[PDB]
Amino acid sequence: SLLKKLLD
Amino acid sequence: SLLKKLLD
Amino acid sequence: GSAPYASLTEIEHLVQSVCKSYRETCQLRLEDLLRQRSNIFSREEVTGYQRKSMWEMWERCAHHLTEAIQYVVEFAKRLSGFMELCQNDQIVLLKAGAMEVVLVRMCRAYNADNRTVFFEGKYGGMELFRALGCSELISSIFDFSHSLSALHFSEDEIALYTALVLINAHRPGLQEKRKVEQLQYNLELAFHHHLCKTHRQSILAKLPPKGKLRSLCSQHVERLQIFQHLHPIVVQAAFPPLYKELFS
Amino acid sequence: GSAPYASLTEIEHLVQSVCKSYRETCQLRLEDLLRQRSNIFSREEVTGYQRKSMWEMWERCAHHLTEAIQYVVEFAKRLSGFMELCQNDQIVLLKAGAMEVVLVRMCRAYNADNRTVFFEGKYGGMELFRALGCSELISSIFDFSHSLSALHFSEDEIALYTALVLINAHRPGLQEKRKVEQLQYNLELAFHHHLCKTHRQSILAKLPPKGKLRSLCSQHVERLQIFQHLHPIVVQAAFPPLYKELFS
Numbered sequence: 001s002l003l004k005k006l007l008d
Numbered sequence: 009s010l011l012k013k014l015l016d
Numbered sequence: 017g018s019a020p021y022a023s024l025t026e027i028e029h030l031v032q033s034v035c036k037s038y039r040e041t042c043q044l045r046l047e048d049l050l051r052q053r054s055n056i057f058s059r060e061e062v063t064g065y066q067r068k069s070m071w072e073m074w075e076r077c078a079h080h081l082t083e084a085i086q087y088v089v090e091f092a093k094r095l096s097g098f099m100e101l102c103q104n105d106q107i108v109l110l111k112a113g114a115m116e117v118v119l120v121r122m123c124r125a126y127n128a129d130n131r132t133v134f135f136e137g138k139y140g141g142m143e144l145f146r147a148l149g150c151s152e153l154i155s156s157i158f159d160f161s162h163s164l165s166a167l168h169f170s171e172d173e174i175a176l177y178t179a180l181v182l183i184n185a186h187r188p189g190l191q192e193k194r195k196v197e198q199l200q201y202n203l204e205l206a207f208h209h210h211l212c213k214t215h216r217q218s219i220l221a222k223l224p225p226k227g228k229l230r231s232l233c234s235q236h237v238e239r240l241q242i243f244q245h246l247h248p249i250v251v252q253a254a255f256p257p258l259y260k261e262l263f264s
Numbered sequence: 265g266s267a268p269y270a271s272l273t274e275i276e277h278l279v280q281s282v283c284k285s286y287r288e289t290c291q292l293r294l295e296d297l298l299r300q301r302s303n304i305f306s307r308e309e310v311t312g313y314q315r316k317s318m319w320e321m322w323e324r325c326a327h328h329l330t331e332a333i334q335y336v337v338e339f340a341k342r343l344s345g346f347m348e349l350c351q352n353d354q355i356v357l358l359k360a361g362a363m364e365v366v367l368v369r370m371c372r373a374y375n376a377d378n379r380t381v382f383f384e385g386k387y388g389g390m391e392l393f394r395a396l397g398c399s400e401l402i403s404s405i406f407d408f409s410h411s412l413s414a415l416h417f418s419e420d421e422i423a424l425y426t427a428l429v430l431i432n433a434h435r436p437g438l439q440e441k442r443k444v445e446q447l448q449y450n451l452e453l454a455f456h457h458h459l460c461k462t463h464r465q466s467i468l469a470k471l472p473p474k475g476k477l478r479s480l481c482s483q484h485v486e487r488l489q490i491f492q493h494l495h496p497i498v499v500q501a502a503f504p505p506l507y508k509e510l511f512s
């Protein structure tokens with residue numbers, strides 16, 4: 001997901 | 009003990 | 017604040033940590049917002065916004081919401097103990113909480129003196145948003161901002177309050193719930209310590225009720241869904257992917 | 265209360281509870297102690313105390329300590345969460361803490377202006393106690409009382425501080441340390457909330473250092489053993505059994 005990608 | 013007797 | 021039995025020194029340090037994280041991710045400085053209050057949309061500009069297609073106005077608002085969310089994500093990433101959480105819980109908290117934090121932050125950009133909000137460089141009333149076709153929602157958001165402006169938050173109060181809007185151990189889908197509870201509790205101690213020191217504990221009773229923020233978010237998703245069925249191509253073609261992911 | 269994640273309301277409730285428990289078990293009325301300050305043993309009365317035999321003076325003092333200790337036992341039994349601790353740990357806390365709490369409460373009966381203490385109906389200096397044959401310990405207790413007097417504690421502050429002197433999760437011999445840790449933390453939160461509200465958080469750095477109460481108590485036990493070896497029968501025949509239990 002995009003939220004996931006923004007977090008790591 | 010006396011503390012026990014005072015406590016219960 | 018993941019560690020139990022936080023000392024007074026640790027609670028004091030957490031207050032400062034949270035305020036610093038907020039300051040560094042607050043998007044617009046309050047000074048700039050207040051300075052620009054004299055920058056208002058002209059009658060012609062308002063007419064122009066009202067003339068806009070529904071799709072163009074929604075697209076603009078979606079972009080601005082996405083920008084504001086991106087700063088809330090950065091706030092979370094800097095927030096004490098958040099990146100210590102597992103990825104699943106980080107995602108659960110932001111998915112549920114990011115829009116809620118944006119709605120709280122927006123009271124900064126609200127001017128009770130003329131009932132306007134900062135939008136695209138200038139201040140305008142709720143009539144600015146007529147082309148969206150969701151006037152009831154827009155009015156509810158203005159009312160919510162007005163109710164928060166009435167609390168007269170300091171920037172530090174906003175930092176501590178929004179940390180708790182985000183770190184909510186009750187959100188469904190958390191895996192390491194105990195870790196989040198511990199984190200929430202420590203942030204609550206921080207919030208309350210700061211309020212105690214500044215004689216502002218009286219504001220706790222006046223904070224938004226349980227379910228008010230949730231309702232606003234639910235209504236946003238509902239109105240987006242109405243728009244998306246009127247204009248199904250524009251969202252996939254032009255809206256920010258993160259916006260579609262969070263709200264579609 | 266031993267319950268985790270105590271809310272602000274629960275913390276406020278605990279402040280009131282601890283203060284109530286203290287008020288009901290504080291032994292002498294503070295107003296009486298303060299108004300009797302101008303009643304001071306005469307030279308002949310001090311001389312009378314100094315001519316008393318070592319055994320009679322120890323016997324009187326053991327009786328006065330035991331009386332004070334009995335009020336501290338009652339305080340413990342009324343103190344939120346204490347009776348919910350297992351009995352072994354109740355006994356460990358009182359056996360170690362009862363004298364510490366008495367030493368703290370005693371600052372109420374100490375006049376820093378003329379370095380006297382309330383004893384058997386009037387105020388006298390440390391020379392009143394010469395017949396005990398432990399002049400260094402007596403001087404150290406006067407110094408301790410003076411160090412506390414300088415903080416000019418309110419009665420509510422004494423309630424909350426003595427609660428923490430008693431509920432000390434570091435006492436060796438606790439079998440359920442975790443429960444004492446939780447009760448201690450909640451009482452810390454109550455103490456700190458009250459101090460923050462009343463602009464008195466400054467006293468935390470001035471409280472007796474680690475080891476000081478321990479030292480006074482260890483010396484009491486040692487001086488008692490010195491006396492007892494010189495006068496074994498007096499203790500068996502005449503001293504309070506609870507005193508013998510706690511300190512022999």
Ligand SMILES: CC(C)CN(Cc1ccc(F)cc1)S(=O)(=O)c1ccc(NC2CCN(S(C)(=O)=O)CC2)nc1
Pocket residue numbers: 042043044045076077078080081084121122124125133134135145150153154157158236239240
């Ligand atoms: C402000 C609302 C009356 C309208 N908006 C939010 C909105 C729009 C449609 C909807 F179905 C639901 C919510 S908006 O999209 O116009 C909007 C979005 C972001 C934004 N941010 C600005 C004000 C707040 N700050 S801040 C965080 O620095 O205080 C940044 C700029 N302003 C308006």
Ligand SMILES: CC(C)CN(Cc1ccc(F)cc1)S(=O)(=O)c1ccc(NC2CCN(S(C)(=O)=O)CC2)nc1
Pocket residue numbers: 290291292293324325326328329332369370372373381382383393396398401402405406484487488
């Ligand atoms: C100031 C100390 C010298 C008082 N002595 C305590 C003592 C005696 C021998 C010893 F090895 C160690 C400690 S004492 O026994 O004389 C004594 C004991 C109790 C007591 N209590 C009174 C003062 C405090 N209050 S209070 C609790 O109401 O504030 C009760 C009456 N006063 C003196």
